[PDB]
Amino acid sequence: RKFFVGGNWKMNGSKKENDKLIEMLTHAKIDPNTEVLVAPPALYLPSVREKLDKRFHVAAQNCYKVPSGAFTGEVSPAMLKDVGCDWVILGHSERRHILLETDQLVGEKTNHAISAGVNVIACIGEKLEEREAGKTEEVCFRQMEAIRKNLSMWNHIVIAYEPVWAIGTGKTATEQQAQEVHLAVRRWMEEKVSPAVAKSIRIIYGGSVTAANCRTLAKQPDVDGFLVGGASLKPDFIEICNANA
Amino acid sequence: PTDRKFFVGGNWKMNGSKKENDKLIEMLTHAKIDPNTEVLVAPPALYLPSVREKLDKRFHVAAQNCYKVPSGAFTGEVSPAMLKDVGCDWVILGHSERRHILLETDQLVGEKTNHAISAGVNVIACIGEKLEEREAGKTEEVCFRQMEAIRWNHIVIAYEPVWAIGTGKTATEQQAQEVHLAVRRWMEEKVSPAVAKSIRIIYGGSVTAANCRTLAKQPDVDGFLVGGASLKPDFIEICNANA
């Protein structure tokens, strides 16, 4: 499985700050075998895509589930491709739990983006109370089912596991905790999709990924890379891109 | 007499592409538009910087939504500071589609509006009641509750008759005027008579070339927040509805 590192800039960006990140990426020494993606705010997708070499993926942080319609404030996969962007992050914890996106809506968005030729990082993960209640797998499998339900092709999907308690808090999952969930999700893929898809699908870890912990997480057999939050805005991102080498 | 500048905003909603945007920009650039009308267009967020470059500053370019802090851990959200950064000075907030499909609360719309204003962005603040709310006699209760959550030189109020938009019913100009008058009276009592006299309240029900002039004549209707017709030649006729 090809190692995959995505940088989620979240709601951070400006012409000046973006240019600084683009310069950092352009002049960085990155393992050529790592797939690298950045996800700027939507206003900046066309300019970031124009300024960054195609070696880097440029992703939207969200999109909707049809090509057009009466959805004030939403953008569609057709629009992403129109501005040269072929990736989207869907189902991020902030969208599910702060902006109230349902499992079903995330599944519909995912099926639509894939149908439109857009690659999807599909995010799943459990809250602290769910983890303490022993419901990590139940939650991850429920969220995965809503994504899997109507999908028949997985070659344009990356799964991102981010425990909600690890997002923005500094409380990174231990490498054993991350490995345990990725292996459980991969074994779910073996029985619910196919062993071939399970062996090839990238499952990346998110949630307080840093230069300091990325190499230990990356060596876990079922961790295939990272979805990076705050550290994607810093030079630390380059070290995370290099975590597998 | 009242002395409010007529205001027409075109909400493109989730419609747009480089090719189709260029056609609309060409249409806007070469049209005969009433010079006394304030004109705004609102493209999908991906296209805001380019639409703002291509359109003369005579036209406002608005985001269709934004969030309530300048930056932070809100994947998929954009802030007023980013709008200013790409040259856009306007945002639509509280649109019925955001309230009812994307589940935005009264409080969240109020927080976004206050923040956008604080950042230096002008706001089209959208309000309006659904069919069962109107049938329950709650038109004013709903509109006033939505207004209170926001509560002005950088605000335009848009009234959306959701009870008509979502059902296929037609709102009459008398029904639009009735709500606009109630909202202006709310502004007069809850803010000030000076603000009430100057604030533009624009109509956000279905507006086409066929009904725009009759709606525009209403004394408390100051323009339109246009839906589907903003993508079509009707938009120019609607911009000219007052003159």
Residue numbers in the entry:
A (entry chain A): 5 to 249
B (entry chain B): 2 to 152, 158 to 249
Original authors' sentences:
Triosephosphate isomerase (TIM, EC 5.3.1.1) is a key enzyme in glycolysis and catalyzes the reversible isomerization between dihydroxyacetone phosphate (DHAP) and glyceraldehyde 3-phosphate (GAP).
We constructed four variants, including a SAD deletion variant (ΔSAD), variant in which the SAD region was substituted with AAA (AAA), variant in which N115 was replaced with Ala (N115A), and double variant (N115A_ΔSAD). Interestingly, the ΔSAD variant exhibited a lower protein thermal stability, with a Tm of ~3 °C, compared to that of the wild-type. In the ΔSAD variant, the corresponding region (K153–W158) was not defined except for the molecule of the region which is stabilized via an interaction with other symmetry molecules, while the AAA variant showed a similar structure as the wild-type. The electron density of N115 of ΔSAD was not defined and normalized B factor of N115 in ΔSAD structure and wild-type structure were 42.71 Å2 and 16.01 Å2, respectively. These results show that the hydrogen bond between N115 and the main chain of S156 no longer forms because of deletion of the SAD motif. Consequently, the remaining steric hindrance of N115 pushes the α7 so that α7 exhibits a more shifted orientation than that of the wild-type. Furthermore, the efficiency of OvTIM ΔSAD to isomerase DHAP to GAP showed slightly lower than that of wild-type in the quick activity check assay.
